[PDB]
Ligand SMILES: O=C1CCN(c2ccccc2)N=C1c1ccnn1-c1ccccc1
């Protein structure tokens with residue numbers, strides 16, 4: 001009960017900032033997650049023994065892939081921590097519990113392949129889940145781990161509160177399907193601009209949490225340039241492996257996934273920042289003004305990709 005997690009001074013200070021990088025010491029990441037749960041939710045939210053067992057089973061069910069790995073899980077959870085900490089009073093007790101867990105679990109058992117590749121491969125998961133294929137799998141893996149003996153971190157919740165938090169987690173994980181982001185943001189834009197956005201409306205809260213999940217999921221584009229640049233290598237390592245596997249199916253992949261077309265990456269990054277990242281953080285900042293640092297960092301990285309094209313690096 002009186003056992004607090006405490007970080008070294010540099011991490012204690014920098015973990016509060018949106019652009020925090022969790023570092024290369026894998027063995028410190030569970031401690032970093034518990035620290036964030038304790039400050040974001042409370043020391044009483046979870047039984048420490050159960051929470052630690054849950055974290056280590058989640059870690060075990062992330063694969064050794066270049067990008068969609070345990071480090072991504074904890075990085076996305078940290079961005080959610082920074083949003084929740086900068087928006088103290090906007091979220092319920094159940095939301096703050098559910099959302100850090102949703103972020104830690106959101107890519108469980110990822111193989112480094114898109115929904116598109118599973119569909120073209122005719123993977124068993126594409127028959128089980130016709131849309132948001134990997135995201136339905138991630139939620140399924142989350143429920144599986146929660147149901148392991150001694151892993152039910154929600155055991156003190158009532159039957160109805162348990163159903164609510166698992167529904168927050170389900171919607172939050174499904175929302176990380178980038179196919180669904182475009183429509184979600186357009187609706188939030190319309191609601192904000194016509195002034196009809198209402199945070200007491202549950203359908204509206206769901207949409208705002210969805211955009212928060214996109215924002216946290218893409219947060220590699222909101223880090224300092226050296227972090228963003230080096231993370232991009234891991235992202236494209238997966239894309240190019242998917243491209244190789246498309247070529248093995250006798251399908252020319254899109255240029256983004258073709259390692260023969262690396263020269264086209266800088267221009268592809270601009271498209272992504274302009275079509276996905278900047279609009280995401282712009283709408284998030286309109287709804288949650290204290291998340292402005294994410295938009296600023298995103299714009300800084302857009303400027304860096306423009307410099308790569310001009311051959312200034
Ligand atoms: O940087 C890039 C290149 C373009 N790209 C992308 C992804 C899907 C479809 C089209 C483009 N995504 C990113 C990116 C930045 C942060 N996260 N992600 C991301 C998101 C989902 C899967 C893998 C990576």
Ligand SMILES: [Mg+2]
Pocket residue numbers: 106107134176177
């Ligand atoms: Mg995902």
Ligand SMILES: [Zn+2]
Pocket residue numbers: 072076106107176217
């Ligand atoms: Zn993700």
